[PDB]
């Protein structure tokens, strides 16, 4: 039906069913998720495999099948022949490093476990964050790819608890998040806190003049190197576009996009122009001689806009030579037939 | 499966609380750790521990409540090897192909 109240119904649900204790369960998870790194790592050693792999195979075992490798990551895991292969190895590890892979697996476990649980935290937070240009339901998403950011990084020897931790690598990952999807034209950290910065300068000027400032008083109250060029830039920055189909006029039946005109496009007038420009132009390169005209006509007709670099063999003094010779001989009997006078443009 | 213990008294629990009290993990001391009748698996001291915590000094601890979940699923503790199908669950204790 409609999407917000399912979401929060769907975790709320399974928070309810499963909240995390205070201390016990994210201790518990946390140890687990710790063992698990360790695990892995000594499964490298004596694998000789890379822990991003060791870390693939324990992941298609406990979250999803070849389903789950298939279609997320296209195909470089053979579904099913490779993963097992993987699996077998882990099994031949003796008593010893067996442990690891069981380790693992249940390690692993526990991760997605800490994840599910601390969901309400994110919304919780993510709800705050809400009018900045983002849907809640974005926002709460990335604000969760922030928890999963904080799980890799937890070290459970430093007492302090997942809470406070998730916080801060939630806020992190919503603002970034928020400044980089919520315009049409990307902007960086920088200008958007600048212009937060100078949208809260013109609240504080809003004050008392009376007078919604000048740019001058943004220039000052903003600070060191802050100018009247520089906030009327930014504050063009910060308008949004607007919509190139918008209800127009009386707001009956009229779209935006029918008035704006076109600039590449030859109108007419512009084809019939190089139709006779060139034709013209043609006939003039074929008359001369092709040493420094043709040099000149593709020096300058053909690639890129240097006298010397301009011909072949033949150094500059000859360039120079024919260039104004047969230049000149060419406007001068194109002053007699008349053709080109008239400014073809 | 249950899961933490305080301390009423100590008995047939995991590797949890054995290196805590250094007696058995240490040396086999677990069944003089039953005090004074034996003189006339797990079992320790008539009740002297209550935390879920590492000993070294008391400080990786835990004090707190004991989960009973009761799983309903089927135990199996000593499977034995029969290869008509790929050897199904486990070996004694040797083997485990599960």
Redesign the interface.
């Known amino acids: 039906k409609i999407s917000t109240s399912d979401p929060v119904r769907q975790y709320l649900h399974e928070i309810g069913q499963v909240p995390l204790?205070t201390?016990?369960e994210e201790?518990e998870l946390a140890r687990k998720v710790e063992e698990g790194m360790e695990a892995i790592k000594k499964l490298s050693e004596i694998t000789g495999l890379d822990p991003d792999l060791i870390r693939e195979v324990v992941r298609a075992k406990i979250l999803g099948s070849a389903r789950v490798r298939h279609i997320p990551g296209l195909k470089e895991t053979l579904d099913p022949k490779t993963v097992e292969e993987i699996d077998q190895k882990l099994?031949s590890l003796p008593k010893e490093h067996?442990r690891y892979l069981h380790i693992a697996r249940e390690g692993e476990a526990a991760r997605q476990h800490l994840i599910e649980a601390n969901l309400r935290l994110v919304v919780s937070i993510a709800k705050k964050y809400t009018g900045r240009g983002l849907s809640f339901l974005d926002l709460i998403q990335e604000g969760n790819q922030g928890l999963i950011r904080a799980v890799e990084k937890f070290e459970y020897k430093r007492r302090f608890k997942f809470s406070t931790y998730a916080t801060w690598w939630i806020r992190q990952a919503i603002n970034r998040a928020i400044a980089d999807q919520a315009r049409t034209i990307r902007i960086p950290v920088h200008m958007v806190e600048t212009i937060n910065k100078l949208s809260r300068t013109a609240r504080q000027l809003q004050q008392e003049l009376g007078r919604e400032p000048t740019y001058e008083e943004i220039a000052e109250a903003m600070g060191p190197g802050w100018d009247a060029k520089r906030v009327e830039e930014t504050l063009k920055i910060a308008q949004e576009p607007v919509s190139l189909e918008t209800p127009i006029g009386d707001e009956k039946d009229s779209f935006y996009g029918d008035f704006i005109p076109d600039e590449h496009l030859p109108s007419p007038v512009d084809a019939a122009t190089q139709s006779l420009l060139s034709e013209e132009l043609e006939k003039a390169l074929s008359k001369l001689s092709e040493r420094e005209a043709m040099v000149l006509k593709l020096r300058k007709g053909l690639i890129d806009g240097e006298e010397v670099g301009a011909f072949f063999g033949v150094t500059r003094e000859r360039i120079r030579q024919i260039e104004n010779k047969a230049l000149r001989k060419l406007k001068y009997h194109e002053s007699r037939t008349r053709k080109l006078r008239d400014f073809l443009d | 499966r249950v899961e933490?213990v305080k301390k009423e008294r100590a008995g047939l629990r995991l590797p949890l609380a054995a290196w805590v009290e250094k007696e058995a993990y240490k040396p086999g001391e677990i069944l003089a750790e039953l005090p004074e009748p034996y003189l006339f698996g797990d079992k320790i001291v008539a009740a002297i521990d209550p935390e879920?915590e590492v000993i070294a000094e008391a400080e990786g601890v835990?004090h707190?409540?004991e989960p009973a979940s009761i799983l309903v699923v089927k135990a199996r503790v000593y499977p034995f090897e029969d290869d008509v199908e790929v050897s199904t669950g486990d070996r004694v204790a040797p083997g485990?192909?599960l």
């Open positions: 204790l201390l016990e201790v099994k067996k | 933490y879920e835990v707190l409540h485990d192909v």
